[PDB]
Amino acid sequence: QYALTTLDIITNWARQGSFWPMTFGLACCAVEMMHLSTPRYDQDRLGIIFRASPRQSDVMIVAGTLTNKMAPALRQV
Amino acid sequence: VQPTKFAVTVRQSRNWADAKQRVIAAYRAWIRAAPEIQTMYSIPFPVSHIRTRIRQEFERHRYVNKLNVVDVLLQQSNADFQETMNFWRQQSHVMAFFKEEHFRGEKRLPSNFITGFLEGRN
Amino acid sequence: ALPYFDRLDYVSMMTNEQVFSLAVEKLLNIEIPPRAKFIRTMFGEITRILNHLMSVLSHAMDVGALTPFLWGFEEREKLMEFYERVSGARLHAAYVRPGGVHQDIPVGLLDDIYQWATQFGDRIDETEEMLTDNRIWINRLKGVGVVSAADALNLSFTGVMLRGSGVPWDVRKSSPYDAYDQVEFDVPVGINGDCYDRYLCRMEEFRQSLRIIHQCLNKMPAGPVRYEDYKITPPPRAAMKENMEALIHHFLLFTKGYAVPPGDTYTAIEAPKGEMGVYVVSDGSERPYRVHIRAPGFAHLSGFDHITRGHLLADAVAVIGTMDLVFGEVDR
Amino acid sequence: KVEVYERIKSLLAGFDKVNDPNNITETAHFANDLGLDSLDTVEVVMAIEEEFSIEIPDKDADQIHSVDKAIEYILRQPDA
Amino acid sequence: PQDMPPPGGYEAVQYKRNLPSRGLFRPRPLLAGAAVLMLYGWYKLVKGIREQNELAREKM
Amino acid sequence: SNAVSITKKYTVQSTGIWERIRRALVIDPNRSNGVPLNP
Amino acid sequence: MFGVLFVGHPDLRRIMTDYGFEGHPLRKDFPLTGYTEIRYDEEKKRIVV
Amino acid sequence: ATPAGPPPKNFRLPPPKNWDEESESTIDKVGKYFLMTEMLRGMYVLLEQFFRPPYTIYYPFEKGPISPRFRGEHALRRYPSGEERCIACKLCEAVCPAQAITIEAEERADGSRRTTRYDIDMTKCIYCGFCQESCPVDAIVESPNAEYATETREELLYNKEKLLANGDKWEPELAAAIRADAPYR
Amino acid sequence: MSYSQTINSLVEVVLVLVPSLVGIAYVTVGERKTMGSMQRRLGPNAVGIYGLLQAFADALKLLLKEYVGPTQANLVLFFLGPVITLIFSLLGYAVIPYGPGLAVNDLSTGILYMLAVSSLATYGILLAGWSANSKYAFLGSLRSTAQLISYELVLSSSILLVIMLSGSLSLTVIVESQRAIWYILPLLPVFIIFFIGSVAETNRAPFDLAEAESELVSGFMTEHAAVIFVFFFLAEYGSIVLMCILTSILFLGGYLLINAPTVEGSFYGLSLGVKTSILIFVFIWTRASFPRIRFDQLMSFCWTVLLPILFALIVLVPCILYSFNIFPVNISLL
Numbered sequence A: 001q002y003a004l005t006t007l008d009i010i011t012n013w014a015r016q017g018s019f020w021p022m023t024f025g026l027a028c029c030a031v032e033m034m035h036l037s038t039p040r041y042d043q044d045r046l047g048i049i050f051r052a053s054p055r056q057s058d059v060m061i062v063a064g065t066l067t068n069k070m071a072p073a074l075r076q077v
Numbered sequence B: 001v002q003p004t005k006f007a008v009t010v011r012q013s014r015n016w017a018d019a020k021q022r023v024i025a026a027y028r029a030w031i032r033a034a035p036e037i038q039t040m041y042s043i044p045f046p047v048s049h050i051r052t053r054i055r056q057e058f059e060r061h062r063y064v065n066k067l068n069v070v071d072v073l074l075q076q077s078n079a080d081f082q083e084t085m086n087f088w089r090q091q092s093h094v095m096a097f098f099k100e101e102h103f104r105g106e107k108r109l110p111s112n113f114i115t116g117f118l119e120g121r122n
Numbered sequence C: 001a002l003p004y005f006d007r008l009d010y011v012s013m014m015t016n017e018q019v020f021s022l023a024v025e026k027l028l029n030i031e032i033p034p035r036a037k038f039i040r041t042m043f044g045e046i047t048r049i050l051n052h053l054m055s056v057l058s059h060a061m062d063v064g065a066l067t068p069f070l071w072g073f074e075e076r077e078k079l080m081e082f083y084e085r086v087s088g089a090r091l092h093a094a095y096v097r098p099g100g101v102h103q104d105i106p107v108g109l110l111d112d113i114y115q116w117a118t119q120f121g122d123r124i125d126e127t128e129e130m131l132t133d134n135r136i137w138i139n140r141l142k143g144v145g146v147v148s149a150a151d152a153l154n155l156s157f158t159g160v161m162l163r164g165s166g167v168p169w170d171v172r173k174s175s176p177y178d179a180y181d182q183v184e185f186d187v188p189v190g191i192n193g194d195c196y197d198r199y200l201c202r203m204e205e206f207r208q209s210l211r212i213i214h215q216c217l218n219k220m221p222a223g224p225v226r227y228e229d230y231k232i233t234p235p236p237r238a239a240m241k242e243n244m245e246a247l248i249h250h251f252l253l254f255t256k257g258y259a260v261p262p263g264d265t266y267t268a269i270e271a272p273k274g275e276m277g278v279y280v281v282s283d284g285s286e287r288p289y290r291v292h293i294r295a296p297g298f299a300h301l302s303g304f305d306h307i308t309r310g311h312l313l314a315d316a317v318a319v320i321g322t323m324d325l326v327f328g329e330v331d332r
Numbered sequence D: 001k002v003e004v005y006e007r008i009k010s011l012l013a014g015f016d017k018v019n020d021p022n023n024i025t026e027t028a029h030f031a032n033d034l035g036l037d038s039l040d041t042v043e044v045v046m047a048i049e050e051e052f053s054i055e056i057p058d059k060d061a062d063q064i065h066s067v068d069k070a071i072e073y074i075l076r077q078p079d080a
Numbered sequence E: 001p002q003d004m005p006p007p008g009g010y011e012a013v014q015y016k017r018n019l020p021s022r023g024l025f026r027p028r029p030l031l032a033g034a035a036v037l038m039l040y041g042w043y044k045l046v047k048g049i050r051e052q053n054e055l056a057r058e059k060m
Numbered sequence F: 001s002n003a004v005s006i007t008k009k010y011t012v013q014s015t016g017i018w019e020r021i022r023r024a025l026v027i028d029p030n031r032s033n034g035v036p037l038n039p
Numbered sequence G: 001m002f003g004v005l006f007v008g009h010p011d012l013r014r015i016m017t018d019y020g021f022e023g024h025p026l027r028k029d030f031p032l033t034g035y036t037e038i039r040y041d042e043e044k045k046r047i048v049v
Numbered sequence H: 001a002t003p004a005g006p007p008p009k010n011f012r013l014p015p016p017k018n019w020d021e022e023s024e025s026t027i028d029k030v031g032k033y034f035l036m037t038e039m040l041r042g043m044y045v046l047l048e049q050f051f052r053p054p055y056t057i058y059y060p061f062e063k064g065p066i067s068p069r070f071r072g073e074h075a076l077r078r079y080p081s082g083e084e085r086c087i088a089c090k091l092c093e094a095v096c097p098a099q100a101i102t103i104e105a106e107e108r109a110d111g112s113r114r115t116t117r118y119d120i121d122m123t124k125c126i127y128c129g130f131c132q133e134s135c136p137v138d139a140i141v142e143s144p145n146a147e148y149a150t151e152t153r154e155e156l157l158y159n160k161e162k163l164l165a166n167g168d169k170w171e172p173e174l175a176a177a178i179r180a181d182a183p184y185r
Numbered sequence I: 001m002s003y004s005q006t007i008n009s010l011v012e013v014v015l016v017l018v019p020s021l022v023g024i025a026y027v028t029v030g031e032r033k034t035m036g037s038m039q040r041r042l043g044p045n046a047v048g049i050y051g052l053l054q055a056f057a058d059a060l061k062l063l064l065k066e067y068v069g070p071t072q073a074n075l076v077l078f079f080l081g082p083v084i085t086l087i088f089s090l091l092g093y094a095v096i097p098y099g100p101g102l103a104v105n106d107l108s109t110g111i112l113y114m115l116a117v118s119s120l121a122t123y124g125i126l127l128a129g130w131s132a133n134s135k136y137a138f139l140g141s142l143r144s145t146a147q148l149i150s151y152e153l154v155l156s157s158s159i160l161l162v163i164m165l166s167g168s169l170s171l172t173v174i175v176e177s178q179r180a181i182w183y184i185l186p187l188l189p190v191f192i193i194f195f196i197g198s199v200a201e202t203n204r205a206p207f208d209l210a211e212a213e214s215e216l217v218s219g220f221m222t223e224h225a226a227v228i229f230v231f232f233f234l235a236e237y238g239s240i241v242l243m244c245i246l247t248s249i250l251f252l253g254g255y256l257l258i259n260a261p262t263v264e265g266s267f268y269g270l271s272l273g274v275k276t277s278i279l280i281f282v283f284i285w286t287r288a289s290f291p292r293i294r295f296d297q298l299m300s301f302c303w304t305v306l307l308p309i310l311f312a313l314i315v316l317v318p319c320i321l322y323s324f325n326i327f328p329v330n331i332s333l334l
């Protein structure tokens, strides 16, 4: 049991320590999202790196108004 | 043509003879494209089933006797044709055109009075 | 409907709400108080700097120049504090309304803006240290996205997309609004109509915006910030709890709204991304019959084919960035 | 040619909008003899175009109104 | 009262372009500097290789 | 000149040996660092 | 938005609405929320109107 | 292009200068090209920034500044006696630009005009402060709180119980923010 | 000899390879922190003390992420490119002298060994883009292969000038021959060209189209998930460190400085490390300082600026050597 928690802690520490979002920056929320990478907050200090493609990404941040015309693209990524 | 692949400049029909040619021309392009439409959107229906839908769409407007209304329907047909042959539509858009693929069925209205009444206005 | 304008060009919130306030004020047939005019002009140029910081630097980041974007977004943080001090929002202030502005500025804001103003010139200069003379930057922008002065007018280009091609034209100069007739500033104009000229116009617009803000700090008059008719602007909360007339006018303005005389108007301002206009039709009631928004980014992106046909795919990122393109403006 | 006609029967007889099979001739007309309205005719020429794997221009298609007219038209076209 | 400017008025702030030239990036001293390092290096390289060549003589 | 004095720009200044180092090394000693003063 | 034809226009197509959208939303008789809406269906494994 | 009237003085540019006529020496021209002088100058700027203090704050141990006007999580307030401030005027429900508020009301058991339903759909609310501006009794306010992200969307459908509890917890901030900004309201 | 040969080779390999990967891991952490200080920010400071565990978090996250391969084109071919790139990117460390002769393989043809293993690494990039079965990403990987071979010509032309000075391809002899003078002074233009070529050879900014996502057609490396990303990224940082080590070897005097065996070895290792670290810092410094060059411009820079200068230097330098009677001896000396 203790071993399996240790791997649990280890694998979770890696998921938290390298948190790579794929920012689907649809609208004005993307501006506040973009301000998390800037010097005042510097998400990189915590290990957050924004990623352009979904293939390299662990988290999807839907930051913006999702229109019907755009929904198929969001489901695809 | 010039602006994008299947772009047709908006023009009025000169007369009823002119309009009929365009309508037949529009139908011909539609049913010709039906094989490509199937494989391009991976439609789970045979080209026969798709081509029937094309005729019914043209048959809803078979009784139009007004030239200006025909020009409107022709412009709509060209716009739908372009956005289909260009892969601008998505499978969800074309699949929604086939009324059978709604989870409540295609007979979405009551057959007669008593079936709709027993279920509660359909 | 006013907060709907914050969310069109959503890095230029106060000028977006400025254009709708001016159009409604025109149909209301009211002259706003002088202090409101100076506050709106002052926040107009603060919002122009916020926009150009987003536009120029993110355009620089798209072609590979990571660092200026980091430096300048700390400047954005400082100016977003001024937006949060006046309203209670970082972005969607809903601050400029028909009749003036929502509330007056807190008593220590002007000096805090002044302190930021004494150091902003250096921030502009350090940005120009990395880009203006850099041969990679020049080779990425010079001769790219050229449009002639004649075609820019026929394509509906406004703002920097028009002034970069040599046409001297600014809505603040040609049709003055708020307090821009009471301030001194120069209009940067390019000559080659390319991405490099449009970059240099925007860098100089930084300095003229700061020059206007300093004049607004010294010319700020005393008085009310909302037109003084409680049939249009809400009364002060102390008046609303004190006298019968004020309470009625408060009740009606927040349930029915003020009635706007019937008619229509096209009102345009020099927004940070070019000529922003709004076309409003009033039917005499408290709801607008029709609101159409003229977004400069809509006209600019409609010209993408004209400016890019025959050119390299590797220059498309340069002209997408040379157009100040936010798609809340484009699509609405 | 005669090989085209034997292929012509393969589709007209299979068409479900014919008034009665075996009514086909060497010169039968779609409208007068076979009872085909306008669009059913548009579909028949499109089925022939598929068989000979040659696209038919809309003006040429308007000219085609009879079994013989199609047999004559396909022979002129090089592809088959 | 209200937020107002100081009675004198706020002092002028810098807004005009300030990217002054500096001697660390003028090309003439840089070219002179580069030439001296190359000239000094070739002087040391002639002396170095000639010595290395004499060491091969002794070793052989 | 174009530049205003660093002594009038509302930013944290350097002092002592570090101000002399700064005036000797930076491209323009009148340029502020953008850090606002807490008082 | 309005369904108005412009004769002589090259490439008169929709610019704002979704592909295959039915109706002209800025008509006074067009209702505010329109007629239809979308969602993801887990049987069809795709979006459905 | 130019305004009507005579051409602006000196609007026409002088003719282009040939290579021969450039007022810049060859050695300087060749030196900048091969030595990349302006690129070296830009690199030197980065070293200057490398030794300047960073702007980063260590959130959540430190926080960025907010004002008494800041618009965050909604709350329902009381009088000092503990009576609800809300009297079901429906001004906030009418002014709401997003239709996020739903209210029902009758006479309370004591005959007082009070609400029975007070819901705010936090997934409809645009955080504009219009309700707080329209309220004649200071009943609906936006708290300074912004850290209330939730696991499910249903947790963002606030009813009257959730909103009155929020006002009970945040009241000293709510009074302080009202105290600072009420002169300007 | 004293102990078993196999034991010696085990220990010597472990001493070079293991601390190398530790250094490559912290070059990525140092890149983030150096650009951050330059960007008025902190960079990684939370994953481990002072952010010292950040690269290990990144690697473990990617190694436990799921891989999304192509539409079953081939299992072997898909991994074949990434495997080749990593192995041959790391193979060049085996001839680096951490002191006179202190290399895994003290090879007399060592310079040519380094050139060969770099040429074999470009295959993995090209074999990856094709295997992705996406004609868009293939063209980017094709452009990246064109840039790598073109600037390989720049590096081997620069290296030929250094061999003329030392008369040897042994990395040790090149370093010993700099006790006379570091080659950066006599060959100053060559050092600048070689450093620029090394940045281009590593797909590093301002030559970074391979990973550029903002450029519309660029970003071939941007479609690499899980293990494949780890392979390509490790290979790139591994090549960055090796191009900085080789630059110090050829121009900055290698392990040379400015009685016990342990301390002599430590000082030689430290001097090589200090010089390598400075070039890694400059390497990070240029990525943060410049915008990105277009593909057509970077190919024109190589073929119409750098190479014509190098081929001119290939004529001049041996003429100077002959004119001053300084053609070196090619026998085993030093």
Ligand SMILES: *P(=O)(O)OCC(C)(C)[C@H](O)C(=O)NCCC(=O)NCCSC(=O)CCCCCCCCCCCCC
Binding pocket: B020, B023, B024, B026, B030, B037, B053, B054, B057, B058, B059, B061, B062, B063, B064, B065, B070, B073, B074, B077, B080, B084, B094, B097, D037, D038, D039, D040
């Ligand atoms: P024949 O005598 O049988 O009929 C000839 C006509 C049709 C001309 C009539 O006799 C007639 O007189 N009609 C009056 C005028 C007319 O024809 N109206 C114009 C109608 S155009 C029209 O209906 C266009 C509709 C196109 C729809 C195509 C299918 C829908 C798109 C989706 C395709 C499937 C999914 C990808």
Ligand code: SF4
Binding pocket: H085, H086, H087, H088, H089, H090, H091, H092, H093, H103, H131, H134, H135, H136, H137, H138, H139, H140
């Ligand atoms: S919160 Fe205020 S405005 Fe809304 S119903 Fe209660 S008293 Fe009226």
Ligand code: SF4
Binding pocket: H092, H095, H096, H097, H098, H099, H100, H101, H120, H124, H125, H126, H127, H128, H129, H130, H131, H132
């Ligand atoms: S903040 Fe604005 S949107 Fe939200 S409930 Fe109050 S009035 Fe409605």
